[PDB]
């Protein structure tokens, strides 16, 4: 049984916590729920930590008083098919292997599944740790509650004696680095300086041995990623997002200065040895668009290359932890602004970007976003109860599972089948254009070896490589983005038509050049 | 937003609260969650209350941190048919009007429905308040959440200007009195002295004007009826139960002294002006058999008459609030011990007992009780989740809704249909004997007018009236008890055969006496 | 495991069984499926039973070769409500007790 | 939950079958290019020996009806071997074609 501590003692040294805790809805929640600070209090001074207090980061720390939200979060959606590779004819990107050749995603890229599994799935995917980590056996893939209790309760490490990234099976890669983990867990929130910069007070940083870092992390999507544990108010903790919104002054809605002001973010900084160390972003409102944008964005979380001179950009560089915070039509400019690309295509040699799940940047400017709808309205709606205290469902999943609450309360003119039909019209149309974009990209890619072996000039090949950059960007955004166009159907259509146009331009350029070599 | 208070200061005067709160699982739960004591603390001494602090009795006080339990409790079971009269051919007691004639239950006795409605249903039933109280309209009968928020949010009073019990419609009765409310709410827990005895510190007592008392009461089945709010430990608050178990030394299991010792109750008394005022019973274990026995027992909560001389026993008498704490075969002796009966039959003139829902006393000695099974195992089981934190369902309802958890985890040899079939075999057999018991009781009752008109002696009529007491007791126990034999099928069988035997004996006696008058 | 007996020997005394068994669709079904007659055959004459043979009356004697019929027979219809008294208002004879008074039913 | 466990194995195994086919097809399509570029029989026979293994360690799993369920670790090890062999053959043929061009 917990015994309460005298918070007044802590507040003497922790004035920011005092200001947050005494005012918010956790004013009565004693520190002992989340901290063991007995030896800390005995040894600390006003500027020196002394003994480090223990801070609980397990989700059960919140489940004691918020069982409904916790249980809704940890539910596993068995209909979200697990470990389903996207580079197959029946999934999102039938020609992905040809198009992505040269990138680590060629080793494995599955569809997402329920949030409970995010940290374990990050650890076990074939592209991440060379196959070092596995579930303890193939039965454990079902165990969402176990994953939430902790990754290392359900996983095994092939070699606990070494800490290097290496292949344990042939067709794996070692793409994981410490930046990835910021979108899987915030167990490291007190051990990682803002942006993962080197810092005397940080145990972990961008340049850490990721296998060692991995072993220290346990819980997925901690509850405090969206809710300040001291004030209970809405927030984000993700450094990359704070950096885009606040440091670079782009705002929470870069296309809408008014909405950015009404629904803004306030950066709060915590220090170690009176030096800035970590930060959070307090939100003006409980705005799920910005909460979910901690992870559901296009980002750099990886080394790459400079567009200018082709030189390596390593994990030590700030650009290795970057939120572009740009929609598809602004992305190329945003990559040029930091002078960065991800990989060289294995066949064409083109410098290319790698896009990842840009849901937040895609949603901007869409009909629903313009009408003040947010991610949670469709993906974590309020529960409807004939007799009961309403709470917000935390089972972040497709609205197909809860159409009454997610769609039909707003769309009174529709039955469930009609609303589903409207979704499918958009997804079917968008997917058809994704498949056509891949057809044309593949046709272009296959001409590169033909052109090379025909003696086509480097000048022509480089012209085609510049077109490849755009053809790829305006296609891959949409295989990366999870709504298959639903979040912004007109933008998807315009982008995918642009992809096809660019590929067709490159095909004509290469075909003409090959033909001139033959004649 | 709540602001915590200094609990240590309260403990300078409240030593029993200190001993309970600091040790249990609510040690970190600040008093401000349930008490507004600002002016109290300013004015109190250890010997004078000063300003009375406010205590919250609403269930929302607990729902803030225990939403799952609250929502499971407030759910309305629409399949529990509402306002369904038991004195009909398709319900529990087809001949109830003939058999109960002379008692207030003849005005209305419906089947039970969901716990959310207990206080509103008590207020609106035709037998209780002369029809003074109604739902605001007939739509409100569905509103369980509204009833829980408070009775007076969903009910209206025909005459707010008067406080007397009287008939507002012809076919109603005014059977309600303050003792009833103890099994519908404990909003009055700080305003009612133990047993409802007169007390200088009690606003309300057994002799209060029940209409005035009613207006001060709001919430059904407060959460603290089973859980101490200070220690969070298991308890009962019902005075009549504590009186039977502790004061009269009967024990929690009168037929099992060993189980009574292992699963016992400790009486804790609170004083006003240094005189005993109220009490609670802390349980050794979380024993739902005893928690549910706060209400699901046979009781006096009414005036009656003495068996010895027929004189009135009014609400002022301690016997007007009494738990018999006796099985069916011990009940007559228990009623003789307090010299009490309920009513005289309108036709036969017999002194008769009135039985109510003796589930706890029926369950004793049954195969399930002897095997350590308790009410909650069948009616409040743990929830089964593929992934989730387990909690205890508070939707206290038939196991038919949750057979996997209620029955089939124990009875692995059965399918759901087999378990239901076993329930129905018992209920069908028991109901058949109830119907035959009523047939024979009705036959006997109908002979009384014939015998009187034939000039049969008072001596013979009195011998028949003595048999009527037993014929009635051994039948009505089983229409009152809600399981239709399931809780103790062999006892139901033995009892109902005894009822029929007694009625047959009386029929023989009267027929012979009538026949002798004709001859 | 059952061992077949010589049915022809039985038929030296049991002529009605012979006429029935040899003609019907159990002509190939040996007597040992339903009778243990070892001591009987040793002691009987055409005019004296001797030791009484054992005859199986259990339904499993037939279920061995006719499982489908046996399983369809033994199935319990849970919808046929059990122990349901007919002398109740919701069953077949609401006034049965008055009308049948004097009878064991 | 049991269905989900089956599907995890089948989905993972099928993804590796599709990737094995992608790499086998890429290798196969280089044979006519190599032949018409004048790549030596010695190199073509080296690639043919790799084709035997690339094929075996793929086709076992399209032939086998459980899509990996009957032995998920073996399917994984085999299909990774198929991909490795195809990749080895692709690199051999690409290098030889390029040397003929230069
Ligand atoms: C002054 C004497 C202090 C008292 C009293 C308490 N803490 Fe403290 N704490 C103090 C310092 C100087 C530091 C280092 C950071 C800084 O602000 O300079 C801390 C650190 C913490 C932390 C962070 C630990 C980590 O892993 O980084 C926590 C969670 C913490 N302190 C909690 C805490 C609680 C709950 C206290 C009351 C029981 C408390 N502290 C007292 C200085 C002082
Ligand atoms: C019990 C001791 C609690 C623990 C542990 C946690 N929380 Fe809490 N929370 C608690 C109460 C009594 C309330 C107020 C309820 C009300 O409506 O008045 C809260 C509130 C929240 C909220 C809502 C805040 C708001 O609307 O402003 C959130 C988002 C919340 N709590 C989250 C939360 C998380 C993430 C926790 C683990 C770190 C957590 N709470 C612990 C009681 C308790
Ligand atoms: C008992 C006779 C079993 C039957 C029928 C099935 N399974 Fe099984 N399974 C069983 C055992 C004893 C084990 C090993 C358990 C251990 O922890 O040591 C398993 C293993 C599995 C696994 C994991 C396989 C792996 O390679 O790690 C899965 C996914 C599995 N079982 C699923 C499963 C399904 C879907 C079945 C019906 C088709 C099934 N099993 C049958 C025991 C038995
Ligand atoms: C936040 C900006 C992220 C960073 C940094 C990383 N990932 Fe991620 N990942 C993120 C989201 C929002 C999703 C779900 C949506 C989707 O498109 O899948 C994911 C998903 C994964 C998965 C599961 C799906 C799959 O591709 O197999 C894995 C295995 C995964 N992510 C691994 C991973 C690695 C190795 C990272 C660093 C190189 C990494 N992620 C970074 C959000 C974010
Ligand atoms: C961001 C991705 C979130 C994470 C992680 C968690 N919650 Fe949450 N929560 C989220 C939103 C968008 C909302 C609704 C805000 C609104 O006003 O519309 C909530 C709400 C809560 C509340 C308030 C009561 C309610 O509305 O249900 C509580 C108590 C709360 N959330 C708790 C909670 C817990 C315990 C979490 C970890 C299991 C958790 N939240 C994660 C967004 C996010
Ligand atoms: C309703 C108007 C929506 C809002 C607002 C958001 N999304 Fe959405 N999303 C929506 C639909 C109809 C779909 C397709 C679902 C289907 O079953 O066809 C999606 C899809 C997603 C997905 C993939 C879900 C899956 O395939 O299981 C993700 C990861 C997703 N959406 C995230 C997301 C975020 C982060 C949002 C706010 C920026 C967001 N969505 C808004 C409907 C709606
Ligand atoms: C001594 C100076 C006291 C302090 C400090 C507090 N209380 Fe008190 N309280 C006190 C007395 C003498 C009484 C009368 C009952 C008795 O024990 O003789 C009370 C009564 C209460 C009650 C019951 C009120 C009722 O309706 O009957 C409550 C709920 C109560 N007190 C709570 C309380 C709290 C929460 C305090 C700290 C904020 C507190 N009391 C201080 C004496 C004293
Ligand atoms: C949040 C501020 C709370 C309020 C208000 C209430 N309770 Fe509570 N309760 C709370 C916590 C943090 C815990 C401990 C959880 C754990 O498992 O550690 C509890 C516990 C209970 C229990 C279980 C007690 C046990 O010994 O097992 C019960 C039965 C309980 N709480 C009931 C309860 C009731 C009836 C309340 C209203 C009067 C109530 N709680 C308020 C947090 C909070
Ligand atoms: C606890 C010992 C109780 C006392 C005192 C009273 N009632 Fe009650 N009541 C109790 C239970 C456990 C039940 C449900 C089980 C059942 O057999 O019904 C009830 C039910 C009611 C109902 C609804 C059913 C009905 O008869 O219409 C009403 C209207 C009701 N009770 C009214 C009532 C009145 C007027 C009382 C004092 C004279 C009274 N109850 C006392 C438990 C207890
Ligand atoms: C709109 C054209 C209606 C249709 C069709 C039905 N109802 Fe209705 N109902 C309606 C109104 C405007 C009112 C009065 C509302 C008020 O608050 O004053 C009602 C009332 C009822 C009631 C309460 C009756 C009472 O005497 O107090 C019930 C139980 C009710 N309605 C149920 C009901 C059902 C079951 C219907 C379908 C058969 C139905 N109503 C049709 C408006 C309309
Ligand atoms: C007696 C009739 C009860 C009333 C009224 C309430 N609860 Fe309860 N609760 C009850 C039992 C028998 C149990 C299980 C005890 C066991 O260990 O088997 C519980 C349990 C709780 C708990 C503990 C966590 C859990 O097991 O779910 C909590 C937090 C709790 N109950 C809260 C609660 C609230 C908020 C109530 C009013 C809505 C409530 N309980 C009423 C018995 C009884
Ligand atoms: C399982 C072994 C049981 C235990 C222990 C208890 N009861 Fe029960 N109850 C049980 C059954 C199978 C039934 C009949 C349900 C049906 O749908 O046929 C009952 C019935 C009740 C009822 C009436 C419920 C209704 O008709 O909706 C009540 C009020 C009831 N039981 C209360 C109760 C109490 C208070 C118990 C502990 C003393 C108790 N039951 C034990 C199964 C089981
Ligand atoms: C003549 C020497 C006999 C031979 C060879 C067998 N049986 Fe017989 N059996 C015989 C007699 C005289 C009787 C008495 C009845 C009669 O017909 O007079 C019997 C009786 C039976 C019975 C019935 C036993 C009973 O419980 O009544 C059976 C089932 C029977 N016999 C079977 C049987 C079989 C299977 C034989 C071959 C192994 C057989 N008998 C030989 C005379 C003779
Ligand atoms: C296997 C050794 C058998 C045992 C033991 C029993 N029977 Fe049989 N039966 C058997 C065969 C091979 C056949 C013929 C099937 C066909 O269609 O050719 C039968 C037939 C029957 C029939 C149908 C007879 C008809 O004329 O249509 C019936 C009704 C029948 N059998 C019943 C039966 C009973 C009741 C048995 C136990 C006393 C029994 N059989 C044993 C094979 C076997
Ligand atoms: O209050 S915090 O800034 O130590
Ligand atoms: O690799 S994560 O970004 O999908
Ligand atoms: O602690 S209580 O008894 O005043
Ligand atoms: O101890 S009390 O009487 O002040
Ligand atoms: O009247 S209550 O006891 O059913
Ligand atoms: O054949 S029989 O009649 O013995
Ligand atoms: O034919 S007999 O009697 O032996
Ligand atoms: Ca990227
Ligand atoms: Ca009674």
Ligand 8 midpoint to CA B25 (Å): 7
Helices D2-36 and D72-101, packing angle to 10 deg: 20
Contact (CB, 8 A) for D46 and D27:
no
> Phi/psi of residue A39, each to 5°?
-70, -35
Strands B275-283 and B235-236: antiparallel
**Residues of chain D numbered 3-32 and touching chain A (CB < 8 Å):** 3-5, 7-9, 11-12, 14-16, 18-19, 22
Distance B137 CA to ligand 19 centre (A): 24
Q: Are B24 and B230 in contact (CB under 8 A)?
A: yes
H or E element: which one contains B55? Answer: strand B54-55
**Chain D neighbors (3+ CB pairs < 8 Å):** A
What value, to the nearest 5°, has the Cα angle with vertex A119 and ends A118 and A123? 115
- Which residues of chain A make contact with B63, given a CB cutoff of 8 A? 389
d(C-alpha D102, C-alpha D93), whole Å: 14
Contact flag A85-D11 (C-beta cutoff 8 Å): yes
Nearest by CB to residue C85, choosing from B89, B418, B428, is B428
* CA distance linking residue A92 with residue B472, whole number of Å: 75
Q: Ligand 9 pocket test: pick from B108, B225, B301, B360 the residue with the most ligand atoms within 8 Å of its Cβ.
A: B301
| Angle ∠(A342,A344,A349) on CA atoms, nearest 5 | 155
Query: 367-386 in A: which are within 8 Å (CB) of D?
Result: none
Helix H or strand E encompassing A36: strand A35-36
Residue A240 CA to ligand 16 centre (angstroms)? 15
Lining ligand 20 with CB less than 6 A are C 14-17
Tell me if B76 sits within 8 A of B142, measured CB to CB: yes
Rounded Cα–Cα distance for residues B455 and B177 (Å): 40
Token couple for B341: 């009966």
- Identify the three-state secondary structure at position D1: coil
Measured between alpha carbons, how far is B45 from B274 in angstroms, rounded to an integer? 13
**DSSP per residue over A452-508, as a string?**
HHTT--HHHHHHHHHHHHHHHHHHHHHHHSTTTTTT-HHHHHHHHHHHHHHHHHHHH
Indicate the helix (H) or strand (E) that contains C15.
helix C15-21
Distance CA B159, CA B336 (A): 41
- Yes or no: say if B300 and B331 are a contact pair by the CB < 8 Å rule: no
Whether the CB of B140 sits within 6 Å of ligand 10: no
- Give the one of A67, A385, A389 whose C-beta lies nearest to B389's C-beta: A67
Mutate to test the interface with B, among A75, A230, A388, A394 (most CBs of B within 10 A): A388
- Return the CA Rg of chain A: 24
Calpha distance B129→B164 (Å, rounded): 9
Name A280's bridge partners: A268
Of the candidates A28, A67, A74, the beta carbon closest to that of B391 is on A67
How many Cβ pairs within 8 Å bridge chains A and D? 68
Q: Which atom of ligand 21 is nearest to the CA of C45?
A: 4
**CA-to-CA distance for B155 and B133, rounded, in angstroms?**
7
Contacts of residue A247, Cβ cutoff 8 Å, sequence gap at least 6: A267
Using an 8 Å CB-CB cutoff, list chain D residues near A453.
37, 97-98, 101
- In b/e form, how buried is each residue of C7-40, taking b as 16+ CB within 10 angstroms? beebbeebeeeeeebeeeeeeeeebeebbebeeb
Q: Which atom of ligand 19 is nearest to the CA of B301?
A: 3
Map tokens 């490589």 to a residue.
Answer: A465
The 8-class DSSP code of residue B152 comes to G
Give the technique used to solve this structure.
Answer: X-ray
Report the 10 Å Cβ neighbour count for C79.
7
Q: Tell me phi and psi for residue B211, to 5 degrees.
A: -65, -40
A24 with A233: CB under 8 angstroms? yes
Q: Which residue of A has its CA nearest to D96?
A: A453
Give burial (CB, 10 Å; 0-12/13-18/19+) of C68.
exposed
Catalogue all structural domains in chain B, each as residue range(s) with its CATH number: 1-58 (1.10.287.3080), 59-413 (1.10.1130.10), 414-519 (1.20.140.10)
**In terms of CA atoms, which chain A residue is nearest residue D102?**
A453
B429, C98: Cβ pair inside 8 Å? no
Is residue B231 within 8 Å of B24, Cβ to Cβ?
A: yes
In terms of CA atoms, which chain A residue is nearest residue B34? A28
* Shortest Cα distance, chain A CAs vs residue B4, angstroms: 5
* Binding-site positions of D for heme: 70
Is A413 annotated as ligand-binding? no
Give the atom of ligand 3 at the shortest distance from the alpha carbon of D8.
29
Contacts by B489-497 with C-beta closer than 8 Å and gap 24+? B489/B426, B489/B429, B489/B430, B491/B327, B491/B328, B491/B329, B491/B362, B491/B365, B491/B366, B492/B362, B492/B430, B492/B433, B493/B429, B493/B430, B493/B433, B495/B328, B495/B329, B496/B430, B496/B433, B496/B434, B496/B436, B496/B437, B497/B433
CB contact (8 A) between residue D4 and residue A82: yes
Q: Do A75 and B388 touch (CB under 8 A)?
A: yes
B65 is in an annotated binding site: yes
Q: Which residues of B331-358 are buried (b: 16+ CB within 10 A; e: fewer)?
A: bbebbeebebbbbbbebbbbbbbbbbbb
Torsion of CA A477, A479, A484, A487, to 10 degrees: -30
Which residue in A has a C-alpha nearest to residue D77's C-alpha? A169
Residue C90 is nearest to which of B90, B425, B429, comparing CB atoms? B90
> A354 C-alpha vs ligand 22 centroid, how far in Å?
5
Is A136 part of the contact surface with chain D (CB cutoff 8 Å)? Answer: no
Measured between alpha carbons, how far is B287 from B284 in angstroms, rounded to an integer?
8
Residue A369 CA to residue A371 CA, distance in Å, equals: 5
Q: At what angle do helices B416-453 and B458-480 cross, to 10 degrees?
A: 160
Q: Which of C82, C94, C97 sits opposite B428 (nearest CB)?
A: C82
Structure tokens at C32: 């040992």
Phi, psi torsion values for C44, nearest 5 degrees: -75, 155
Whether residue B357 is annotated as binding a ligand: the answer is: no
User: Atom 29 in ligand 10: which residue has the minimum CA distance?
Assistant: B139
State the Cα–Cα distance between residues B173 and B177, nearest whole angstrom.
12
* Radius of gyration (C-alpha) of chain B in whole angstroms: 24
- Residue D65: CB atoms within 10 A of its CB come to 8
What are the residues whose beta carbons fall under 8 Å from the beta carbon of D43, sequence distance 6 or more?
D34, D92, D93, D96
Cβ distance B74 to A386 less than 8 Å, yes or no, reads no
Structure tokens at B241: 């139960």
- For B346, half-sphere exposure in the C-beta direction (CA atoms, 13 angstrom radius) is 12
């Amino acid at each position: 049984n917990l015994k309460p501590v005298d918070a007044m003692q802590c507040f003497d040294c922790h004035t920011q916590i005092e200001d947050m805790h005494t005012v918010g809805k956790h004013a009565t929640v004693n520190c002992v729920h989340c901290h063991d600070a007995t030896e800390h209090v005995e040894t600390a001074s006003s500027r020196r930590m002394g003994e480090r207090p223990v801070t609980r980061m397990d989700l059960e720390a919140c489940a004691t008083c918020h069982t409904a939200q916790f249980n809704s979060f940890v539910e596993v959606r068995h209909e979200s098919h697990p470990r389903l590779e996207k580079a197959t004819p029946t999934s999102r990107s039938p020609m992905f292997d040809k198009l992505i050749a040269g990138h680590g995603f060629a080793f494995e890229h599955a569809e997402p599944r329920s949030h409970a599994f995010m940290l374990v799935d990050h650890f076990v995917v074939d592209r991440a740790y060379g196959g070092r980590f596995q579930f303890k056996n193939w039965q454990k893939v079902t165990d969402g509650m176990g994953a939430v209790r902790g990754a290392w309760t359900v996983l095994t490490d092939a070699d606990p004696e070494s800490s290097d990234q290496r292949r344990f099976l042939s067709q794996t890669a070692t793409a994981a680095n410490p930046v990835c983990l910021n979108c899987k867990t915030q167990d490291h929130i007190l051990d990682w300086a803002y942006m993962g910069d080197e810092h005397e007070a940080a145990k972990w940083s961008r340049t850490s041995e990721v296998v060692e870092f991995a072993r220290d992390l346990n819980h997925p999507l901690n509850c405090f990623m969206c809710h300040d544990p001291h004030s209970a108010g809405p927030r984000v903790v993700r450094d990359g997002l704070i950096n885009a919104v606040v440091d670079r002054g782009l705002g929470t809605y870069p296309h809408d200065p008014v909405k950015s002001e009404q629904q803004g973010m306030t950066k709060v900084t915590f220090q170690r040895g009176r030096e800035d160390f970590r930060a959070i972003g307090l939100l003006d409102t409980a705005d799920s668009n910005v909460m979910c944008a901690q992870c559901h964005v296009e980002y750099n979380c990886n080394p790459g290359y400079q567009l200018s001179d082709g030189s390596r950009v390593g994990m030590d560089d700030r650009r290795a932890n970057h939120f572009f915070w740009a929609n598809v039509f602004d992305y190329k400019e945003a990559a040029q602004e930091i002078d960065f690309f991800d990989f060289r295509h294995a066949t064409t040699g083109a410098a290319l970007p790698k896009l990842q799940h840009p849901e937040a940047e895609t949603f901007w400017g869409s009909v629903h976003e313009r009408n003040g709808v947010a991610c949670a309205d469709c993906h974590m709606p309020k529960v409807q109860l004939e007799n009961g205290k309403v709470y917000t469902s935390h089972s972040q999943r497709t609205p197909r599972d809860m159409m009454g609450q997610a769609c039909l309360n707003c769309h009174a003119e529709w039955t469930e089948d009609q609303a589903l039909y409207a979704i499918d019209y958009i997804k079917n149309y968008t997917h058809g254009k994704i498949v056509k974009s891949e057809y044309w990209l593949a046709k272009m890619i296959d001409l590169f070896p033909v052109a090379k072996r025909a003696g086509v000039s480097e000048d022509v090949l480089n012209q085609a490589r510049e077109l490849h950059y755009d053809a790829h960007l305006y296609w891959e955004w949409w295989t990366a983005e999870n709504s298959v166009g639903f979040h912004n159907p007109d933008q998807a259509r315009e982008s995918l038509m642009t992809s096809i146009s660019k590929s067709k331009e490159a095909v004509s350029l290469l075909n003409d050049a090959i033909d001139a070599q033959v004649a």
